[PDB]
């Protein structure tokens, strides 16, 4: 579907997209190739849906956290710049776009949130979150407020949640160990909800409202990234960019992003995109053009980062970055974020308590790994006749009981529905690893095309088991794990909210309990 002889680029609407379009023009000048820059809404959700069908842009810009998902689904070209080009960027930026040992995007700029304050209202900004309520009472007596920032996107609230011990995935990354509902995270989120309760903040505040309030001098502080600074310059607010406040004596820990540019695997213009990015964008003049539209942060390109490093707003961005953590790029980042977005919104609005919101968030963040664990073990033990000896790990009680439940219910389905299982198995002609990939697409669609309950879920998994037995029979045992990942993937993507609403696999256990 993608058109040859041209470049289509997607980038978020808070970045310097007119600036990018000028770098575009310059590429056209030399090559005769038109460059179109677009900034559609929800482009990070839209890219994977459209790229899957071989559609979408040639180039997508986003922070690096999303790109492992994209690579895992096969949606990105492996980029292989030569050593001379690699040496022009900071190795840590290349690290942020490395997935399964392969480079999967070009890094552009490092982004962290800072505290932005209005110096005419607050000559000295607060060192602690704890002093903010009193500061707010003080500012409200003069018709102003202390702080406003986007409470609709968990990226802005995370530095506080993480300050006293909240984490996504532990310290490689242990995907088994999630810290979304530990006491640290509870305390950070509770402090936020109290802010709202006591009228220091409003749960409906979003990007635009916080931006408008700060940029007209109604609120003394916001929380935002470098991209925001241009609009504040335009507004004549006398602002500073500084270190985020501490919570319970500990630094606020923002999740640091590396703005990154990946090339669509379905693109017929890969040499053009590589040439654009390496030799027009990632140059002193290319990045300047973008930075002057909307500041990029600390750019990946060493030569231009040296000029920008002198700016104290960059120094403050790097100081907040140093106290935070580089985002993981693992495929589960998307589910983590979706879960935490929901938890913050619901806690803030009062729809759930902090305990309920973060419990649900934890379940959602663990859902993939846990489902895979159960599903994978079932298919393998069914195929070989023997259980996996290794420990279940964290949430092991749930996993173990789900597996025992599934053994009872799934064996019953296979036994009672042998005929049809044999029938559809026999129809499909599973002989190789290629034919197994085919199978998924069918299961993918047969599952998705129907209602939602545990019987249909058991049925999907049991058929998986039935196929697994076959695959061992014909010495294709290597294909069982990919079958399990595939089944798990349809299950947790299409059924996420229903699964969370059931208390995940504890609900499966209860529903089929004798
Ligand atoms: C495996 C299969 C699926 C199926 C998939 C498939 C096909 C291929 C492929 F890759 O993937 S993925 C998938 N995911 C969820 N469901 C599926 O099926 C059920 C219906 C069902 C079917 C067979 C057994 C039990 C079935 O339900 C039992 C059920 C549902 C609710 N509660 N309980 C009771 C319980 F709680 F106890 F489970 C559903 O959609 O509701 C499926 C769908 C239909 C099937 O046979 C149709 C009959 N042709 C057989 C072949 N012949 C040549 C033509 C006729 C067959 Cl075999
Ligand atoms: O809100 C969760 C969101 O956080 C990050 O998105 C940031 C992005 O990194 C920044 O470049 C800037 O545009 O603001 C976004 C927040 O609205 C993650 O990168 C993203 O994947 C996640 O959903």
Swiss-Prot record:
Disulfide bond residue pairs: none
Any GO molecular function: carbohydrate transmembrane transporter activity
A Pfam family hit: SBP_bac_1
GO CC terms of this entry: ATP-binding cassette (ABC) transporter complex, substrate-binding subunit-containing; outer membrane-bounded periplasmic space
Major location category of this protein: periplasm
Keywords recorded for this protein, A-Z: Periplasm, Signal, Sugar transport, Transport
Protein family according to the UniProt entry: Belongs to the bacterial solute-binding protein 1 family.
Quaternary structure, from the entry: The complex is composed of two ATP-binding proteins (MalK), two transmembrane proteins (MalG and MalF) and a solute-binding protein (MalE).
Record-given protein name: Maltose/maltodextrin-binding periplasmic protein
Gene name linked to the record: malE
